Amino acid sequence: ATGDERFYAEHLMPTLQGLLDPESAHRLAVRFTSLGLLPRARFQDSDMLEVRVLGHKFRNPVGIAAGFDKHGEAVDGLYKMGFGFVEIGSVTPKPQEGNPRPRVFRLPEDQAVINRYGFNSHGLSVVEHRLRARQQKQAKLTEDGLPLGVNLGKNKTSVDAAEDYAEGVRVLGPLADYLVVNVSSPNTAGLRSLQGKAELRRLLTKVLQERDGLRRVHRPAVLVKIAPDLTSQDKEDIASVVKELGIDGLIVTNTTVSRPAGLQGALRSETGGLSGKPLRDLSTQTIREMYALTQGRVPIIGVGGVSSGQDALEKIRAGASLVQLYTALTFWGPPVVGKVKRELEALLKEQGFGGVTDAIGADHR
Ligand SMILES: CN(C)c1cccc(-c2c(F)cc(-n3nnc4c3C(=O)c3ccccc3C4=O)cc2F)c1
Ligand SMILES: Cc1cc2nc3c(=O)[nH]c(=O)nc-3n(C[C@H](O)[C@H](O)[C@H](O)COP(=O)(O)O)c2cc1C
Ligand SMILES: CCCCCCCCCCCC[N+](C)(C)[O-]
Ligand SMILES: O=C(O)c1cc(=O)[nH]c(=O)[nH]1
Ligand code: NA
Ligand code: NA
Ligand code: NA
């Protein structure tokens, strides 16, 4: 456990980063993971990490965020890594290549990444068939407390964003425990402007209609994923629409197009979304605000700069029922998953919580 953690963090990951540019390293990470080339996590999930939310059991509250496995190629490997749930995507209706390379940048001095992938996607049909090949295997995983989320995007050339998302609901909804719609990615022109109220209501109404039209055992929860870059007005409006329409949850947050003061990385002024440690507390505060605006009645998946039990627990106490991480993997490697779970368990005990569920939103009380 702690042996592998130190070796990866101090030696192996710095060495890999020295050899491979970020996108190449990402591709290698997906390949290794899809092949199961990693230590089968020794950390046995305890009962106090179990969470029941979004109509499912989650064996532990630590998930892999969207964008690591964009095309659904490494799902089983990610469960093997110890994630309590897996979110794939974003997936666009038609295949598209995304932005020109280079489009991924490391900021090692900041434990951050900047990306402008631009929703590179194999497209719905490819991902549909990939998930169909393991549909019953997933049904069993979900029953065993390891659910699957699918994050739905839209094509760069789309004329009707709502129809892109509707297509995603129809094609991948039947294969997902939950679906995600971003009003929040920084690398598609006009995507975030789906945050405006009357239009946001229109979009999400259409998405929920399509979801409701699926057969009962194929009917996923629907969540909205937001950026940390929203105005106070934006957040009020989203909270209102989410409650009005009965949206099942929020993912808080995507990457930031802000550049917090103090970034040291040479590549800090690259265009794209910033992830990792400089995002952490901005994300946590966005969780805190959305939890309050929804009266704690709307499940939140908290994400941004998590690499420790403390980071995870801060988001849970702020209002998250579950958390995700991504960028930590790129600096700590696979052992970070067991690290976060072990540290989270220890902190829950230390702060007198019976389990994760008791800690959700605790700061507000
Ligand atoms: C040694 N073994 C068995 C093993 C198994 C499974 C995975 C890995 C693994 C890893 F988890 C992460 C990386 N990695 N290194 N630098 C970066 C990455 C990224 O994944 C990444 C992703 C997105 C933007 C940027 C990056 C990025 O800069 C490289 C890996 F090989 C290693
Ligand atoms: C390289 C990269 C690609 C990403 N791609 C997506 C994506 O396709 N869809 C999405 O909703 N979020 C995407 N994200 C955002 C992550 O899901 C997550 O919200 C964000 O990175 C903050 O978590 P972290 O600090 O633990 O990385 C991506 C992030 C990174 C770093
Ligand atoms: C309140 C705005 C702050 C902007 C970003 C804050 C980053 C916190 C620095 C701690 C991260 C740990 N490390 C090793 C990556 O430096
Ligand atoms: O594909 C991308 O560029 C991307 C999508 C998203 O939702 N978030 C992010 O940081 N990048
Ligand atoms: Na399934
Ligand atoms: Na379902
Ligand atoms: Na405002």
Q: How far is the CA of 25 from the centre of ligand 7 (A)?
A: 39
Nearest of 198, 100, 105, 195 to residue 156 by alpha carbon: 100
User: Ligand 2 pocket by C-beta < 6 Å: which residues?
Assistant: 65-67, 70, 89-90, 104, 113, 115, 117, 151, 182, 185, 225, 254-255, 275-276, 279, 303-306, 325-328
Write the residue with the smallest CA distance to atom 11 of ligand 1.
Answer: 333
In sign, the C-alpha dihedral spanning 29, 117, 232, 195 is negative
**What does residue 107 show for φ and ψ, rounded to 5 degrees?**
-120, 75
**Whether 343 contacts 5, CB under 8 Å:** no
Look up 125 and say whether it is catalytic. Answer: no
For residue 122, CA distances in Å to 97, 154, 172 come to 8, 12, 13
Q: How many Å apart are CA 147 and CA 150, to the nearest integer?
A: 10
Ligand 1 mutation pick, 5, 26, 274, 339, max ligand atoms within 8 A of CB? 26
Nearest of 74, 71, 60 to residue 117 by alpha carbon: 71
Question: Resolution in angstroms, to 1 decimal, for this deposition?
Answer: 1.8
Q: How many Å apart are CA 166 and CA 48, to the nearest integer?
A: 37
Ligand 4 atom at minimal distance to the Cα of residue 188: 3
Count of alpha carbons within 13 Å of 145, Cβ hemisphere only?
16
Q: Work out the burial of residue 154: count CB atoms within 10 Å of its CB; fewer than 13 is exposed, 13-18 middle, 19 or more buried.
A: buried
Q: How many Å apart are CA 117 and CA 113, to the nearest integer?
A: 12
Strand partners, 256: 274
Nearest of 334, 354, 343, 346 to residue 16 by alpha carbon: 334
Nearest of 176, 184, 104, 182 to residue 134 by alpha carbon: 176
Q: Which of 121, 158, 185, 307 is catalytic?
A: 185
**Whether 336 contacts 328, CB under 8 Å:** yes
- In degrees, rounded to 5, the angle at the alpha carbon of residue 356 between the alpha carbons of residues 353 and 361 is 85
Q: How many Å apart are CA 183 and CA 196, to the nearest integer?
A: 9
Give the other-Cβ count within 10 Å of 10's Cβ.
Answer: 10
Where b means 16+ CB within 10 Å and e means fewer, 34-49 reads beeebeebebebeebb
Give the other-Cβ count within 10 Å of 262's Cβ.
Answer: 8
DSSP per-residue letters across 105-174? EEEGGGTEEEE-----B--HHHHHHHHHTTHHHHHHHHHTT--EEEEE---TT-S-HHHHHHHHHHHHGG
DSSP per-residue letters across 21-82? -HHHHHHHHHHHHHTT-S-----PPPGGG-EEETTEEESSSEEEPTTSSTTSSSHHHHHHHT
327 three-state secondary structure? helix
**Whether 334 contacts 8, CB under 8 Å:** yes
248 three-state secondary structure? coil
DSSP per-residue letters across 330-359? HHH-THHHHHHHHHHHHHHHHTT-SSHHHH
Q: Which residues, including other chains, have CB under 8 Å from residue 329's CB and lie 6 or more apart?
A: 29, 64, 68, 336, 337
Amino acid at 198: A
Amino acid at 154: K
**Whether 335 contacts 307, CB under 8 Å:** no
Q: Which residues, including other chains, have CB under 8 Å from residue 164's CB and lie 6 or more apart?
A: 92, 93, 152, 153, 154, 155, 158
Residue 55, sorted as left (phi over 0), alpha (psi -120 to 50) or beta, turns out to be left
Question: Cα 219 to chain center, whole Å?
Answer: 20
Q: How far is the CA of 254 from the centre of ligand 2 (A)?
A: 6
- H/E stretch holding 179 reads strand 178-182
- In degrees, rounded to 5, the angle at the alpha carbon of residue 85 between the alpha carbons of residues 84 and 89 is 150
Ligand 4 pocket, 255 CB below 6 A? yes
Nearest of 123, 102, 202 to residue 162 by alpha carbon: 202
67 is in an annotated binding site: yes
Q: How far is the CA of 48 from the centre of ligand 2 (A)?
A: 27
- H/E stretch holding 180 reads strand 178-182
99 is in an annotated binding site: no
Write the residue with the smallest CA distance to atom 12 of ligand 1.
Answer: 330
- The tokens for 175 are 């294969």
Question: Cα 365 to chain center, whole Å?
Answer: 26
Which domains are delineated in the chain?
1-364 (3.20.20.70)
- H/E stretch holding 315 reads helix 309-318
Where b means 16+ CB within 10 Å and e means fewer, 317-330 reads bbbbbbbbbbbbbb
Q: How far is the CA of 39 from the centre of ligand 1 (A)?
A: 14
**Whether 180 contacts 251, CB under 8 Å:** yes
**Whether 230 contacts 195, CB under 8 Å:** yes
Q: How many Å apart are CA 180 and CA 301, to the nearest integer?
A: 11
Ligand 1 pocket, 113 CB below 6 A? yes
Experimental method: X-ray
Where b means 16+ CB within 10 Å and e means fewer, 344-354 reads bbebbeeeebe
295 three-state secondary structure? coil
262 is in an annotated binding site: no
**Whether 59 contacts 45, CB under 8 Å:** yes
**What does residue 218 show for φ and ψ, rounded to 5 degrees?**
-115, 20
Q: How far is the CA of 278 from the centre of ligand 3 (A)?
A: 4
**Whether 78 contacts 33, CB under 8 Å:** yes
Q: How many Å apart are CA 41 and CA 146, to the nearest integer?
A: 15
